[PDB]
Amino acid sequence: EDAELLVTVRGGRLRGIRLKTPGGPVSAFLGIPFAEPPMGPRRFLPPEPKQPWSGVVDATTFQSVCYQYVDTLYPGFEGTEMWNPNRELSEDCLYLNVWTPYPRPTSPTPVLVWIYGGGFYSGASSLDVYDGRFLVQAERTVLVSMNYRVGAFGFLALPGSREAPGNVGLLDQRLALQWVQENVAAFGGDPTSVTLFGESAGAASVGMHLLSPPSRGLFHRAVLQSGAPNGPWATVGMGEARRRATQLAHLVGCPPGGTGGNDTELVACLRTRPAQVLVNHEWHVLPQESVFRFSFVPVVDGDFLSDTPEALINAGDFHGLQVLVGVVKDEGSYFLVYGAPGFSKDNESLISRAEFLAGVRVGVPQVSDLAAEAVVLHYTDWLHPEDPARLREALSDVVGDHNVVCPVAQLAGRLAAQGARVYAYVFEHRASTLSWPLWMGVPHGYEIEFIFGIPLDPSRNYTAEEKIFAQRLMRYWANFARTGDPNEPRDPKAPQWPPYTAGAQQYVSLDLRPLEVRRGLRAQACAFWNRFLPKLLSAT
Amino acid sequence: EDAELLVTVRGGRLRGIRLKTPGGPVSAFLGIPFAEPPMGPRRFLPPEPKQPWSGVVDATTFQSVCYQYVDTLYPGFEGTEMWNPNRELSEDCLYLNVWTPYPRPTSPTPVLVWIYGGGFYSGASSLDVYDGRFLVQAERTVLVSMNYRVGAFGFLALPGSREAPGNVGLLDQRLALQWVQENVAAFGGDPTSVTLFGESAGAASVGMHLLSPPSRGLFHRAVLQSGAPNGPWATVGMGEARRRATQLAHLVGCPPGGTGGNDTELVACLRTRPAQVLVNHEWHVLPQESVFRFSFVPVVDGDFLSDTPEALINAGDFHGLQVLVGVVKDEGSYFLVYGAPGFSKDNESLISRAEFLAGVRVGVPQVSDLAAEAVVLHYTDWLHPEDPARLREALSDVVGDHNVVCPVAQLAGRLAAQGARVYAYVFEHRASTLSWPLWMGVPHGYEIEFIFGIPLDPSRNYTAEEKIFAQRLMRYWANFARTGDPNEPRDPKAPQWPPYTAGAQQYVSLDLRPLEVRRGLRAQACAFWNRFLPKLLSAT
Ligand SMILES: NC(=O)c1cc[n+](CCCn2ccnc2/C=N/O)cc1
Ligand SMILES: NC(=O)c1cc[n+](CCCn2ccnc2/C=N/O)cc1
């Protein structure tokens, strides 16, 4: 037994495991319980801190994945199954993982806290692409990642009641952040240099912690990848959250016909149902047929979020804060094979204009007929209004701009103009091992494997240029964690990454080629979403 | 060493296995290849007989399941998992199984041949509910069950071409019937007393072998359980079969962008696609939103079926043939949860009047607005036209009568009036271990476990009375297989089972109570489907 695999924390002792990288070993502590199991009477309730334990807790393997829907659209397909749970499903899932270099750093080291995405209905910290053994070995930093409750178990909200207050999945993340403040020093980490970074729903979660006062004192830097809290999918109304929760209870037989009419007996009936029963009816509570919309998401309850995320961003101070935001080239292509008519991953998806007009109503739900007419005007090439290849790219840009790119550009503009130093990027490299069709380009979620240094894994068929590209990306994220600046504090030979300002709107392209500075995060297209369309809906 | 576990057939030698029953041992020969693997260039082609092999083929375990869609509507639910494949999926699946008593019968024994159901898109002969160790031990008969290609691999039809002629899944069953004629004597079976029996799509398959001359001379008695070849779901036209096959090719990228669209190049493109790719787009070719409809079913091609099953039944002679038909009480309740609005297995499914009107358009597709009005009249109790419990039962009877009961009642009428001795039953016992909700009553598919003597398995939690009831049904089915008459030839004390005639229309009820003769297989309801509705559609 080695001396660096035994660590004592405020709850007790843990035995870690020594992972192996092509360039040196690394210590890991996988499966640390940071909360009591939210089972039985504690379902839908905020997390309670883990009670101290006797003996040594085995932290050599990942723990259970929180109960979640499992994607069955393309069974056996690598592109979809790489995001499915790789452990057993259980409500006993509130566990975090810590990677630390070997030998353990004798000086305090910056800490990176990863929050997985998955539309607030799925995801796990044990996926292969979230392996932090390569980022910790190459850049000698401390990586922490936790599981949080997703779906109804983490975001079912009956606003007003105390049996289902909502946003408990966000409280799972906050409790894990407090755990890092109280225990990351035992692993060689600096609790005064914590960098939150997440992707999609994790990026939205990172943004919601910026807007929540109790969570702001737990980290110092933020990285939002392909997501933002002001997105049209990230939050839901107090009344809509009550309707979605009530219909879910109706589908599972709650309340028993017909006694009961208050939230106390409604939640009491939900707590008796098996976990899989609630999951099988999760998608049946959405109001409309749509893509990029999810049943149970964070709610604006006045507690965790005192107001809407857009309001908190406009009227907030962000001085002394470094933020790194960015998107991929084709944000919307991934979500079109999940409901848009005429789209299939097994053909070229050469849609007609009739299918394009129907896809706009699916990609942009809850809009008037006039608002839909404005969308098809701005995204139609009127020289070739019937070209299937251009209509395919157009609908991909419609979903991408409406859901990811423009809410990110809106957030990045307000952050830089209110004190924060913001850096922006656009990931434009398609991995050579990508199993999705070519017409999707660089889809949503496929920059994560390069940030985590997955191409360094010799058992995978990546190219030599992609391995160098992975190390360069790991340097950017690490430099931003230590200094708050992605540039190398002493490098003059490499091109510089200029900050993003509301006026110049400068960003860089991440590719196999060196850095290239550009201007405008789709400024012309996002002016329609952020400026005009709000006013087009105010007048019905 | 047991000598009765080594059998030589016309292809080679086989090593069997001796299974255990609470009343004695039984020899089993599971996984006997009866055809060459239909892979590569043989996909969509008729089966070729298995060429003789050297050595000894191991017949001690079930072989692979044919490629098929897997139900993911209720993951982990016993009611649906029990029909999913229990072996690896592979196109190498043409294997049959033989159960024979120990000691091997020294006299020729009648042979039962089982054909599984599953809407021609799924099913396997290796399911636990199809285990023939109990029927063979208790009644000392020979039970044979085979796999046949389902879905597109067994019923994709481009009529006209020889690259995808259609009905090859039915030809897989015929080749297994010819195998029984040539080799069942080696197991102690009588090839002059072969009794076909299937359920749902298997029952329709048994009915289609009665109407095909080449298959007629391979068996002598037939049992059709909850299915008939004249059902609105069992067949499809040559034009519709071409449209469904062409769209499936389009969804998988066939033909390539700029290639000719003839049948030779189209089937050649489908043979290059992986098996799972064709399965993932199987349900995307149905024309309308409907229940109890399946993509690739047998086609009326003029070869296997010279005319429609309805025509061949009317213009056919059935003298010297004993048929046993029957249905369960609640045939339609199972299919409601797959798409009828307001239906869910986890609540009471107390639908409204508006949901009932929408469910009629789903349960009875392809009909005009006036035809749907007539269905609403016959199945609405106008004294309580909005009672949710009565509307739930009404839509269950709508789907049950339209798809199962009335197509069965018409088949039994024309058979008895044209020389065949027909016996009819109605299964009315709900199993005590049934996991489906109580409002479904006796769902479709849950009499099979009692015919196969599953309650005799000690590991199951069935009641004592259900074991005696299982032995009764095994006696009825065996007596029919032996003599063509389900009644006991030695016991005049038990109530007799009278034949079904076109005038008296007599049947019996099967439950824990003794036999009870009734009259009319939904005579008033089926007169609407079999007599009036065809005339209502002729005048549009
Ligand atoms: N069982 C169903 O009918 C069903 C419907 C919709 N979904 C939503 C798929 C997820 N999705 C939709 C739009 N974008 C996404 C995200 N995919 O990662 C799943 C299942
Ligand atoms: N949304 C889908 O991908 C889909 C899956 C399965 N189906 C068919 C389910 C099975 N079924 C439908 C109607 N009747 C049945 C019988 N099931 O046993 C339809 C659509």
Side-chain angles (χ1 to χ4, degrees):
Chain A
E1 280 182 78
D2 199 297
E4 295 208 353
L5 298 185
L6 280 158
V7 173
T8 302
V9 302
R10 289 194 178 185
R13 283 171 289 160
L14 306 159
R15 171 171 279 102
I17 189 176
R18 186 145 302 170
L19 308 182
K20 180 139 48 60
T21 79
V26 56
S27 305
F29 297 84
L30 317 173
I32 307 173
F34 67 92
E36 290 292 314
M39 311 184 63
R42 283 178 302 196
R43 184 190 281 181
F44 310 118
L45 288 185
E48 291 176 326
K50 183 75 194 72
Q51 302 281 32
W53 59 86
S54 302
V56 170
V57 161
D58 190 89
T60 64
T61 183
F62 295 107
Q63 267 296 325
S64 302
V65 175
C66 300
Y67 250 100
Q68 63 185 240
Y69 174 86
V70 179
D71 194 302
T72 52
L73 189 71
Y74 296 115
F77 180 56
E78 184 198 311
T80 53
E81 252 155 49
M82 61 179 291
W83 312 104
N84 280 330
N86 60 337
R87 291 293 188 270
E88 295 213 22
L89 301 183
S90 175
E91 301 198 63
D92 182 11
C93 62
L94 299 185
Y95 302 86
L96 56 83
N97 322 277
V98 178
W99 289 265
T100 182
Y102 182 70
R104 188 187 309 179
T106 52
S107 180
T109 302
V111 185
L112 279 67
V113 181
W114 169 255
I115 308 182
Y116 57 79
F120 296 107
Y121 72 89
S122 57
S125 58
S126 56
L127 299 184
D128 292 358
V129 290
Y130 304 157
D131 202 309
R133 78 177 64 182
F134 301 97
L135 182 63
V136 165
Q137 194 279 333
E139 299 296 323
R140 294 199 93 266
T141 178
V142 173
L143 191 96
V144 180
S145 63
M146 85 295 287
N147 285 339
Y148 61 91
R149 284 175 289 175
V150 299
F153 311 100
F155 296 102
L156 178 135
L158 285 184
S161 65
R162 296 186 179 272
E163 299 97 329
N167 302 327
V168 301
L170 295 178
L171 298 176
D172 299 340
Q173 307 179 4
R174 177 193 284 173
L175 182 59
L177 291 181
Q178 296 171 338
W179 188 96
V180 176
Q181 285 294 315
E182 298 175 22
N183 299 277
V184 84
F187 304 90
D190 185 8
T192 64
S193 184
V194 181
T195 300
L196 276 179
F197 74 131
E199 197 266 358
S200 213
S205 297
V206 172
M208 295 182 188
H209 287 308
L210 286 166
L211 312 179
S212 192
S215 306
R216 182 62 184 90
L218 305 174
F219 66 104
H220 316 85
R221 301 175 182 91
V223 176
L224 293 80
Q225 308 180 182
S226 303
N230 46 315
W233 49 265
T235 56
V236 84
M238 254 183 165
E240 182 69 15
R242 172 167 297 274
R243 188 200 63 84
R244 296 182 180 182
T246 300
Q247 189 182 354
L248 174 68
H250 166 76
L251 292 172
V252 303
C254 296
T259 172
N262 62 336
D263 297 353
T264 298
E265 300 208 320
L266 197 63
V267 177
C269 180
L270 288 182
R271 281 199 255 257
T272 68
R273 295 297 179 271
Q276 194 67 49
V277 170
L278 299 185
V279 178
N280 295 341
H281 301 284
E282 178 180 350
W283 293 104
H284 299 163
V285 306
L286 278 180
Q288 315 151 69
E289 170 193 47
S290 61
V291 299
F292 223 134
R293 290 300 186 273
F294 317 108
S295 301
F296 301 95
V297 296
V299 62
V300 186
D301 60 337
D303 189 9
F304 194 98
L305 297 171
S306 59
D307 210 332
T308 65
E310 181 189 359
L312 298 173
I313 291 164
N314 295 330
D317 197 299
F318 301 105
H319 285 87
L321 169 66
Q322 303 87 302
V323 181
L324 172 58
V325 297
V327 295
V328 305
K329 179 189 172 187
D330 301 302
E331 286 282 350
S333 62
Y334 175 85
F335 303 85
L336 297 182
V337 292
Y338 281 91
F343 277 92
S344 163
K345 84 166 186 61
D346 295 312
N347 57 27
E348 293 288 349
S349 290
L350 303 176
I351 65 175
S352 65
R353 185 158 192 87
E355 294 170 334
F356 173 82
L357 297 180
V360 170
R361 312 310 295 264
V362 171
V364 193
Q366 248 204 303
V367 296
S368 52
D369 295 333
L370 183 62
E373 285 280 339
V375 178
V376 309
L377 160 76
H378 198 91
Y379 286 92
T380 299
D381 191 339
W382 294 103
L383 260 174
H384 325 273
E386 307 256 307
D387 191 4
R390 288 194 178 92
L391 292 173
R392 181 191 64 199
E393 281 157 270
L395 192 59
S396 172
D397 284 326
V398 168
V399 177
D401 297 350
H402 170 49
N403 287 307
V404 180
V405 180
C406 299
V408 159
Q410 171 80 88
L411 170 65
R414 288 313 217 100
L415 286 189
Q418 294 177 206
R421 188 160 78 257
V422 176
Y423 300 84
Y425 67 89
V426 170
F427 195 85
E428 307 192 280
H429 176 65
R430 173 185 172 93
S432 53
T433 60
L434 187 47
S435 52
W436 287 104
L438 231 174
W439 61 265
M440 296 192 185
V442 181
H444 171 88
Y446 288 90
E447 88 286 1
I448 304 178
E449 47 194 273
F450 289 92
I451 302 301
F452 279 91
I454 300 301
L456 297 184
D457 196 335
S459 63
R460 301 177 181 269
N461 199 15
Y462 284 88
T463 66
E465 306 88 289
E466 289 173 328
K467 297 177 182 177
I468 305 178
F469 179 50
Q471 299 177 288
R472 181 159 63 93
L473 287 179
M474 289 189 293
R475 185 82 63 174
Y476 289 146
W477 265 245
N479 288 339
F480 180 80
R482 316 185 197 98
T483 71
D485 192 313
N487 303 276
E488 208 119 14
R490 299 177 182 266
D491 188 337
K493 42 173 174 54
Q496 297 285 294
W497 187 338
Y500 176 91
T501 55
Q505 307 177 2
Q506 303 180 78
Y507 68 95
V508 305
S509 69
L510 299 178
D511 215 317
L512 295 182
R513 321 181 324 279
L515 280 190
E516 172 185 352
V517 181
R518 301 175 188 175
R519 291 186 40 170
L521 261 180
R522 310 208 61 181
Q524 211 61 40
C526 286
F528 163 74
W529 296 102
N530 296 333
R531 298 178 179 267
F532 180 66
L533 209 153
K535 293 175 180 175
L536 192 56
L537 300 180
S538 301
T540 62
Chain B
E1 170 63 27
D2 197 327
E4 293 192 9
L5 295 182
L6 288 146
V7 174
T8 303
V9 300
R10 291 192 179 184
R13 297 190 304 276
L14 307 162
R15 183 182 305 275
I17 185 177
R18 215 165 67 210
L19 308 181
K20 258 177 168 52
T21 79
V26 161
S27 304
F29 298 82
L30 319 174
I32 308 173
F34 66 91
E36 289 294 325
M39 308 186 62
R42 291 207 187 98
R43 183 188 283 181
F44 310 116
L45 293 186
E48 288 181 323
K50 180 59 179 178
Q51 280 154 347
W53 60 87
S54 59
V56 179
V57 158
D58 187 88
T60 65
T61 184
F62 292 110
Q63 268 297 317
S64 302
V65 175
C66 301
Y67 249 98
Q68 63 187 242
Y69 172 87
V70 176
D71 193 303
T72 54
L73 188 68
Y74 295 108
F77 176 56
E78 172 187 327
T80 47
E81 292 295 332
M82 59 179 291
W83 313 101
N84 279 331
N86 56 341
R87 296 303 146 107
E88 281 291 295
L89 296 184
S90 174
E91 304 194 59
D92 197 312
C93 65
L94 299 185
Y95 301 86
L96 59 86
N97 323 280
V98 176
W99 284 268
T100 180
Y102 183 79
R104 186 182 310 179
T106 52
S107 305
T109 307
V111 182
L112 291 147
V113 178
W114 169 257
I115 307 182
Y116 59 79
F120 297 109
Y121 71 89
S122 61
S125 59
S126 55
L127 302 187
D128 298 352
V129 291
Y130 304 156
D131 194 2
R133 72 177 63 178
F134 303 99
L135 182 62
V136 164
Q137 196 280 329
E139 298 295 328
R140 301 218 329 108
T141 172
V142 172
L143 183 51
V144 177
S145 63
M146 86 296 290
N147 288 334
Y148 61 92
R149 285 170 291 177
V150 297
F153 310 99
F155 297 101
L156 178 134
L158 284 183
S161 67
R162 302 204 310 105
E163 303 279 29
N167 301 314
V168 304
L170 295 177
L171 297 179
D172 295 336
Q173 306 177 0
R174 178 191 285 172
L175 182 55
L177 291 182
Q178 291 171 338
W179 189 97
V180 173
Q181 283 293 300
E182 295 176 24
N183 301 280
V184 83
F187 304 89
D190 185 10
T192 61
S193 181
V194 182
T195 301
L196 275 178
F197 72 131
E199 198 265 0
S200 207
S205 295
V206 174
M208 294 184 191
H209 287 309
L210 287 166
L211 314 179
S212 192
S215 304
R216 184 72 165 277
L218 301 179
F219 66 103
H220 316 83
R221 289 179 264 269
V223 176
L224 290 79
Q225 308 181 187
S226 304
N230 50 309
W233 51 264
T235 57
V236 82
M238 296 198 309
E240 181 66 22
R242 170 167 296 273
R243 189 202 63 82
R244 297 182 181 182
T246 300
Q247 184 177 0
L248 175 71
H250 168 75
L251 292 173
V252 302
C254 295
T259 321
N262 61 330
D263 296 354
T264 299
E265 303 173 39
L266 195 67
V267 179
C269 181
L270 293 182
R271 282 196 256 256
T272 67
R273 295 297 179 270
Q276 194 67 50
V277 175
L278 300 180
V279 178
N280 294 344
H281 303 284
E282 194 186 54
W283 297 100
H284 298 167
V285 305
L286 283 182
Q288 309 142 291
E289 185 98 333
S290 63
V291 298
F292 220 137
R293 289 302 185 275
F294 318 104
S295 298
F296 300 96
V297 293
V299 63
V300 181
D301 62 334
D303 191 6
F304 194 97
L305 299 171
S306 58
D307 211 330
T308 73
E310 176 182 341
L312 295 172
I313 289 164
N314 295 335
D317 185 293
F318 304 97
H319 283 87
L321 170 68
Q322 303 86 67
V323 188
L324 173 55
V325 296
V327 297
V328 306
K329 195 209 299 182
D330 301 298
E331 285 283 343
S333 61
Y334 172 78
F335 304 86
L336 287 178
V337 285
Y338 280 94
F343 275 92
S344 167
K345 84 166 188 60
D346 297 317
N347 57 23
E348 296 295 327
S349 288
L350 299 172
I351 64 176
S352 65
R353 181 71 184 183
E355 292 174 333
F356 174 82
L357 297 178
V360 170
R361 308 310 294 261
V362 170
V364 187
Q366 310 259 6
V367 296
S368 56
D369 291 3
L370 181 60
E373 290 279 354
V375 182
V376 171
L377 198 140
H378 270 86
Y379 290 93
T380 293
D381 164 87
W382 296 99
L383 198 50
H384 320 96
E386 305 199 315
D387 190 4
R390 284 190 172 93
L391 292 173
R392 181 191 62 198
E393 302 168 55
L395 189 56
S396 173
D397 292 332
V398 167
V399 181
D401 298 336
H402 169 51
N403 295 280
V404 183
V405 181
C406 298
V408 160
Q410 183 171 52
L411 172 60
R414 315 291 285 110
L415 285 187
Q418 293 175 201
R421 178 180 293 268
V422 176
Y423 299 84
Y425 68 90
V426 169
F427 195 83
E428 303 196 288
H429 177 66
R430 174 186 173 92
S432 55
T433 56
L434 187 55
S435 53
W436 285 104
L438 200 146
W439 63 264
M440 296 193 183
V442 184
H444 169 88
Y446 290 93
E447 87 286 359
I448 305 179
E449 51 195 79
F450 288 93
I451 304 302
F452 280 85
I454 302 303
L456 298 184
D457 195 333
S459 60
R460 311 273 183 168
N461 200 12
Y462 280 90
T463 69
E465 311 88 290
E466 287 173 326
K467 298 182 181 180
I468 288 100
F469 179 52
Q471 293 174 314
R472 281 181 49 200
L473 298 179
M474 288 188 293
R475 181 59 56 87
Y476 289 148
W477 261 246
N479 288 337
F480 181 80
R482 291 189 282 254
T483 71
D485 192 311
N487 297 276
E488 282 277 22
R490 307 176 183 178
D491 191 10
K493 312 177 67 63
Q496 297 291 297
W497 187 341
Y500 178 91
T501 59
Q505 305 177 7
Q506 300 181 83
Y507 67 94
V508 299
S509 68
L510 298 177
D511 50 0
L512 297 186
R513 307 172 307 108
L515 273 192
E516 164 185 313
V517 183
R518 301 176 185 174
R519 289 186 48 172
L521 270 180
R522 308 268 301 180
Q524 292 305 130
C526 290
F528 164 76
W529 294 104
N530 297 334
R531 300 177 175 269
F532 178 65
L533 193 74
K535 292 160 185 167
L536 187 57
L537 295 173
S538 295
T540 305

